[model samples]
Structures are given as C-alpha cells and as structure tokens.
Target: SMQEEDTFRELRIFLRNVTHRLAIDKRFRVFTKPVDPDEVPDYVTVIKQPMDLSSVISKIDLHKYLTVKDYLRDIDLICSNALEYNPDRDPGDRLIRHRACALRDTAYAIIKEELDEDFEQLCEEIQESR
Candidate 1:
C-alpha cells in the first residue's frame, strides 16, 4: 500500500509527459484523437484493441491503469493498430504509418528512461520524504 500510491503518482507524471509530447507534435495529429468508426467502417473489424492519444489520456485522468505496464500496452496498441490497418499500400496511409511508428518510438524512449533507475530513485525519495 505504501509503495503503491507513490508509484502511481510517479507513473502519472511520467505518462503525462509522454502524452504531451505526442499531443503537441504536428505529425501526430491524425492519431491525437479517437478513430471514427463511421469514417473508417472497417477500423473496428480489423483492430480488436483500438487506441489513441485521447483514449490514453482519458485512462490516465480516470486512474484506470493499475500499472505503467498496462498503460504501456495501450500505447503500443495505438501504433500497432494503425500499422495493421494502413498496411503500407497507399502513399497517404504510408505517411500515417510513418507518423505512427515515429510517435510510438518516441513514447517508448521516454517510457524506458523513466522506468529505469531514475523512477526507482524517485520512489525511494518519496518514501524517504514521508
């Protein structure tokens, strides 16, 4: 219980920075919002677990994620879903795929550094402060 609350706060701040980076990037505009089922009728058919920046932030706002691992999975899904649906066919979709891959890589890079010793030490300091 003691460590759990501290961990969540650390994870929350970490996730916020990850999301803000993606949200502000102009290239990620298409992925910044939830996909419209009507606009892409087959989107739901192909992608079982659809995800986006808005959805990720919504989960963060609601405190739905129990661990950073779960949050990371959703982040992965957002890019993987786009890659699967776009399929490198059209030049336009290829651009979408490109943006998706880049953003995913960026998100993971931030996540990786935070989950390393810095985050552990952050938690350690939290406990020490109390």
Candidate 2:
C-alpha cells in the first residue's frame, strides 16, 4: 500500500511539472474582466493554444486498474470552484486574481506529466522564451 501511495504521489508531482511546462509553452495567460452583458455566463476565455487532455486520457485504460475517474472528478470540482471565485471583485488583490491562472497552469502541468511525449520540445521552447 505504501509503495502504491508513493507511486501515485510521484505520478502527481511528475504530472504537475509537465503541466507547468505545457502551460508555459502554450503561452496561456489568464485574465479576468467584469461580466459583460455580451459575454456568456461562466465562460472561460482561452487566449492561447488549448491543450486537450481529455482525448489523451480517454486512450488510457486507467479504468481497468485504477480509479482514474474519481481523480478526474476531483480535479474538475477544483477547477469549477476556482472559476466561481470573483477575480475582478478586488482589483487591488493581485494574488486573488492570479489564483485562477495558477490553477490553470497546474492543470496543464498534470496533463503534461501524464502525456509526456506530446509537448516536451514545445515546453523547452517556451522555457527558452522566458
């Protein structure tokens, strides 16, 4: 059990690093503005190249050996809650507004970790740009 836990923990860390790299590569910037009347409710404006982790994840047979569904469900809930927070309410609190960006970066990182082959070179390029 301990070994399994350790493996999962390492997997999570690896995923995080990969996701961060991917986010940097995509030039994903998260900004918040007032809910304009013309904008759709709960809309997330993706300003950069989007990473589709769902397609990759669907190819994996995680359902056979692990509860990957639960893990993904939890990740979804976390993102939903982060999105619900009003980033524009307190203009002075830059940290609060940046929380969503940080979360997006993290999500990207996890996907990168899981799908290691897709974006390594792109990630390297992004790092070079920084």
Q: Backbone collision count in every prediction? A: 0, 3
**Minimal lDDT window, size 10, model 2:** 47-56
lDDT of 2 by residue, 1-130 (tens): 5655454445445544443453354332332222333663433363122223332233222421132333344344434444454445566444544555565556546654564543444333433454
Model 1, runs deviating above 4 Å: 118-130
Query: Runs in model 2 with CA error above 4 Å?
Result: 1-69, 92-94, 115-130
Please estimate how well model 2 matches the true structure, expressed as its whole-model Cα lDDT. Answer: 0.41
Evaluate model 2: give its TM-score. Answer: 0.30
Encode model 1's per-residue lDDT on 96-128: one tens digit a residue: 899988988888787777678666566556546
Best model per lDDT: 1
- How well does each candidate superpose onto the true structure, as a TM-score? 0.80, 0.30
